């Protein structure tokens, strides 16, 4: 199923059928939200932050416990990313690859693995331009 690769991996997360908060959960929704903003204020992402709340606070799902997705909580409190998370790490990923090529010009596979990356960025950047999350004039590098 992977593009740019032949892998057929299916490993993922399995959202439970029940969409209500767990019965054992006995923490106020507001006390969750103040935890969300503090971690984001520290600089942590919606992806990592969910791991922290799920790992150490019993928050199975921010939407289930609080009723809203975490981006909306962060946006409601004024915390938003410059660019969508998926694209930002793709950009940093390409930067790390590019910085690698100047020092080592004979890394010809890394030259290929580079090509696979911005092609992913162009497809992701194109989609984000259509939905208007990303301003139209935006171009990669």
């Amino acid at each position: 199923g992977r593009m740019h690769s032949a892998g057929k991996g299916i490993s993922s997360s399995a959202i439970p059928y029940s969409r209500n908060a767990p019965a054992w959960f006995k923490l106020s929704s507001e006390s969750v939200i103040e935890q969300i903003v503090k971690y984001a204020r520290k600089g942590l992402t919606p992806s990592q932050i969910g791991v922290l709340l799920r790992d150490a606070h019993g928050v199975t799902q921010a939407r289930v416990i609080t009723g809203n997705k975490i981006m909306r909580i962060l946006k409601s409190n004024g915390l938003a990313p410059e660019i969508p998370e998926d694209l930002y790490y793709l950009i940093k990923k390409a930067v790390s690859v590019r910085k690698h090529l100047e020092r080592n010009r004979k890394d010809k596979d890394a030259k290929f693995r580079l090509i696979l990356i911005e092609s992913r960025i162009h497809r992701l950047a194109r989609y984000y331009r259509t939905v208007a999350v990303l301003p139209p004039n935006w171009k990669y590098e």
């Binding site: 520290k42 600089g43 942590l44 992402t45 004024g78 990313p81 410059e82």
Partner: peptide, 22 residues
């Protein structure tokens, strides 16, 4: 948590960087 924290992810972060840049 400290290593996984990003200096430039949110709107306010780059604006802080923009403030220090000039």
């Amino acid at each position: 948590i400290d290593k996984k924290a990003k200096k430039d992810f949110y709107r306010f972060q780059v604006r802080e960087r923009k403030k220090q840049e000039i």
